[PDB]
Design a protein around this nucleic acid. Sequence first.
RNA 1: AUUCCGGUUGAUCCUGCCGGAGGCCACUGCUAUGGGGGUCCGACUAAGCCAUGCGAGUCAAGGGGGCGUCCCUUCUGGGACGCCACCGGCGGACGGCUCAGUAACACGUCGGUAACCUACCCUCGGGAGGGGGAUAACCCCGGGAAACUGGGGCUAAUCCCCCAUAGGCCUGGGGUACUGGAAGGUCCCCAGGCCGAAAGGGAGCCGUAAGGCCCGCCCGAGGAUGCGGCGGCGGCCGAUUAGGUAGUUGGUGGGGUAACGGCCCACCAAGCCGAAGAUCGGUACGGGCCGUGAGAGCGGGAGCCCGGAGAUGGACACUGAGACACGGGUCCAGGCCCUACGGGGCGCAGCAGGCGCGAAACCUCCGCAAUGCGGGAAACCGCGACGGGGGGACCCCCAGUGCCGUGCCUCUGGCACGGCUUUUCCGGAGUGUAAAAAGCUCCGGGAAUAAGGGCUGGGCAAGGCCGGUGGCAGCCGCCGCGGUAAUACCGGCGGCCCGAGUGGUGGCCACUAUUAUUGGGCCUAAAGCGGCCGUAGCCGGGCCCGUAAGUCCCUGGCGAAAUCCCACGGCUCAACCGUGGG
Lengths: 96, 173, 124, 93, 242
Amino acid sequence: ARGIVLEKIAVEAKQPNSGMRKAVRVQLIKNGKVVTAFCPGDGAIKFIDEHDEVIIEGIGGPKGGSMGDIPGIRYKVVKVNRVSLKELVKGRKEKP
Amino acid sequence: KRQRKKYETPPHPWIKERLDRERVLMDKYELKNKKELWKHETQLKNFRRRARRLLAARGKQAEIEREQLLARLKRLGLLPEDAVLDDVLSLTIEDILERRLQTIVYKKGLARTMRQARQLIVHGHIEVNGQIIRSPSYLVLKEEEDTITYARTSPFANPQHPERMMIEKAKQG
Amino acid sequence: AIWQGRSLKKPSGGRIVLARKKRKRELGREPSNTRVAEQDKRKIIRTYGGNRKVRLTAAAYANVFDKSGKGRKVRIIRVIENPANRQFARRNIITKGAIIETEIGKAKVTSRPGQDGVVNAILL
Amino acid sequence: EIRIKEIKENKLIGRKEIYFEIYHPGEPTPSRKDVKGKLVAMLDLNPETTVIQYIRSYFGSYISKGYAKAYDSKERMLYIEPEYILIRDGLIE
Amino acid sequence: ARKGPKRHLKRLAAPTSWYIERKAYKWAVRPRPGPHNMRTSIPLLYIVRDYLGYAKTAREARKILNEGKFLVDGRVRKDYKFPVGIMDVVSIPETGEHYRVLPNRIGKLILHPISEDEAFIKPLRIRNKRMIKGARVQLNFHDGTNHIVSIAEKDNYFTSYTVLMKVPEREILEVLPFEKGAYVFVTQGKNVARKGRIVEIKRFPMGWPDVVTIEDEEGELFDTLKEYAFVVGTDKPKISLP
RNA sequence: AUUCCGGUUGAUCCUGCCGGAGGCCACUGCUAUGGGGGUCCGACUAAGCCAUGCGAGUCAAGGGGGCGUCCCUUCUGGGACGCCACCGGCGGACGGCUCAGUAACACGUCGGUAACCUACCCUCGGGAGGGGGAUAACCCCGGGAAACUGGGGCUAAUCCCCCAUAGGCCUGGGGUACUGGAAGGUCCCCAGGCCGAAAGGGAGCCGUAAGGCCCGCCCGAGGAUGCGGCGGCGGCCGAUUAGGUAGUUGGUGGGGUAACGGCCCACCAAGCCGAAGAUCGGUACGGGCCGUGAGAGCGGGAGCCCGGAGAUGGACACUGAGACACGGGUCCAGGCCCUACGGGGCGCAGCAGGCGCGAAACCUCCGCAAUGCGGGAAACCGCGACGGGGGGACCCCCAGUGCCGUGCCUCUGGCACGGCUUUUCCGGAGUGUAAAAAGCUCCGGGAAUAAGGGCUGGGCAAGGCCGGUGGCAGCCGCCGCGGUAAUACCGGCGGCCCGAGUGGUGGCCACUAUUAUUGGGCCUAAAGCGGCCGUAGCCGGGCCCGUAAGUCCCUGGCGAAAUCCCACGGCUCAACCGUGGG
């Protein structure tokens, strides 16, 4: 789904796992609900900024639910402004 | 309506036993893809499927289909002329691997190496029954086994092509 | 329109939703309402498949028949009794099975003016 | 060379129908003019009335299939045989 | 939605009695209404193109039919949609060639060649009898043709009898009757392209026709329906039957 | 092809749940997908909204014309050809497009019309007379911006109209033959009434001519094509929807219909459905089928074919054989384009392109041929049907990116030396356009000339060392790793797996005996109600006689094709196609 991001939020891994996970909150262009998507990778949040077009899918948790050490987050971004996240994580391409 | 793949993927891609066995096999025959081995195993398995359905089958159609099966197996050069249904289960993958066109041409001495036979087949330097075939995965019938011959226009047809010297020395050597 | 089609209710009672529009092959036509007059006025009607059918809107004469089988063309004075409806006899309406009074006397109509275009009856 | 597999006779159309094979080992598929002018010899046929429809060049084969007509009069071919193949054979500009 | 009479027929839906390749193209010749049913006939165009190979392209075939070089039942027909059905005689005088249309053992139609002398006789099953004004008797055949005869000659015919019809001039030659022991060639069913003799006629009420039992040459007994039974001789077939 | 394994514990065994391991369908990253052959692409949301182009025409053999050309002869002129347009013969009720409704005799099967219709088509018997009348086109003038639209002159037929008779209809009476198991119908006679046919023809041969040959007309009786209506059975969820239905259910007598019937209407009655779940709601075109599974089964109806339904929503007519008619008409609702404001036109859920929508689907392409349809006696003509051709990491089949001798090492392979083929590409030659293209098939020039994705602690077992990161950064489907030495995070190297594909996500079957009839549990893990009675339902002792409803064996019709299994033949093989058997 395609969404527009509003705010950057960092959360604490559930114990005993400790770690500051970066994620964003997005309003869906389709209907307008508000949902958080996790950003995987290293230095991902640096690319993303306020008011950014994004594309988002499900996290692939058990029954689609949460994964591992992050709580309830059901989604991850794949493309930001029609540019795929992973290569920007690799840095091969450039964000617009 | 969609056409199905002709091969069956292994139920698990990382069993050490099966992986190394397949490795030994494709080492022996120098195939390009495990897909090829899988296809050959597939037609082996379907031969056996027919055999097993028929061995318990009763009825005139069953007998006729059984005779058709036996006849085609014989015609492929995979069985003796006195073969009986009971033995067809004992057919191994290697029985079909030998019957591969590429293995036959290498076994005719016309190639020093399996891959050289492949290069000839793709490059068309071989002819069968007066018609050229470019596919090293084709399965050869018994009746054609004597007609496997150099393609006429092929430079290898002449007895002076320098590679053919090395081919002959490998044959006799 | 005049639509001679499915009852909107099931035999049990569940109301039936329609799923398609009506069809011209399925509609009917107006009632003739044949009446007593001084002259015969008739309308021919083109019908399904190009057929024809003539329709008496006013009737003046009738073909009465004796039990022997001999027919008399005669006039029609008035209708005695209409078993189909009570309003019809009051309004000189002519329909099959009606009891009619002619110069000869009492006759029973054995023909439908609506479809036949003529009125035949049996002297009683 | 040319070897005839079949010659049959459409009497309702007054024409000969010829199936043949062309041997061309190692040499390109022949042009229409040569095959016509060379087939015209060994059945004693008029060039104008004769038309060749298709010469199929087989993959990986030195034998090409060939199939051709032979009519008996000028008018019949114009009446029946459609203009395109006449243009291919040159019988019509 | 559809709104009345068709004018097309896709190849895939064609009847199973036609030796026509089905996935080569999509459109076929819809037969116009005619003597024989869809299930027991084929357009003449396919006869010209496939079964005789005289025409490769339908346009050329139609041209040859326009020339009127073809004699079906002693009548030229230009309609390239003519249903040429069962037990018809196709005659080409330009070639002096004569075939009869007959089904297969599988349930498909073939042109069995016949002698020229036989080409003028056509046996017709008597489908039904009727009285027309003037007290005249009109007989409707299996192929849909009709023959008128006198009241006195009414008992000469009964339904399910075979009349050897002289198609060139429409003259009645002989009437093979339906009685025990006749020679009968089957028309439809699993017993298609069978020829045998009759032992019994099964009188079936409740909507089910007469099941005749046929005894083959080798003596094997089987059953088929009345309407599928077509008599061709009292004890031997009067026509060449494969 | 009937396969597991990891995670509850200081340690073990159960329970059950979850996670990996496979196929199928949609979206997407990276990478290319070079070569070919079969197969698909608004495929679920907006059946929401459009500029544009096209798609449905053909008739000179009905007829009269007018325009122009030819030729002849010409005071009179005929024929031939083309254009125009005319009533007129036909068609635009097929085919193309889609799945909202619809839970239904819409539909699958079998019957089912004796209660229907039917133009073009076929067969058989008969008939084709007389008479009259009309107005287009063309010429004289006209309006309005238009759309569109006036009057006068004369003109044609197979046009229209009246009559001739048959013939159509309905009834009474009286009979007899055909059909058929059946009923009654049809056949004939008599009697009563209304309605109530035609068409000739362009040319040529013989005949002075008529006439015959060819085409065309009409009545009647059949057939055939297509369609109308009746029926048993089959095929969803909900009870936190339990009572329901008034032309409701049946009877009498009629009406209208192509036709039977509550389809309607007047009267007479009190029915009919529902716990082997009506009613109501939710949901949804039905089938051939397809994905998965060892199979029992589970799930789904997008792509082709068959049937059903629709043309923004509703509603109503005319023409007609066939219609309520995507490319015909009228109003209302709705939003849009033109306009002297008077007037006008509306529908790309037809094909090619657009707007919107959204994660999410192609060219404003060419020929009328191949096959088919309408036309016409024929030639032949139109078709966004079709055919091909285009973009696309749809489905499936094949195939390549070098081979060989040789020294050293990386001795798995690589490196260099020698020799060898030309994968792809370029020029010519055959299809090929039914005009290109298709780039296929062979020749000649000749190149070593295109390979990436994921992973490397374990479940999956398989793929290990170095540098940096230090409970931050981050990884991770589950365990879990990381607080300074990390084989588990990131870079490199090394390695493994697959392969022109691989990876991530989503949904479906197996995994799953975690849906259990095959084949599950209920003392301690969640699961037996506190006990008893009993209606329907389900399951029920043995022996003798009968039956054949079930059950079983044989036998005819039928369950259409395409898809599926098998042998054979063609395409180089394959896929695909054909023939034959299931």
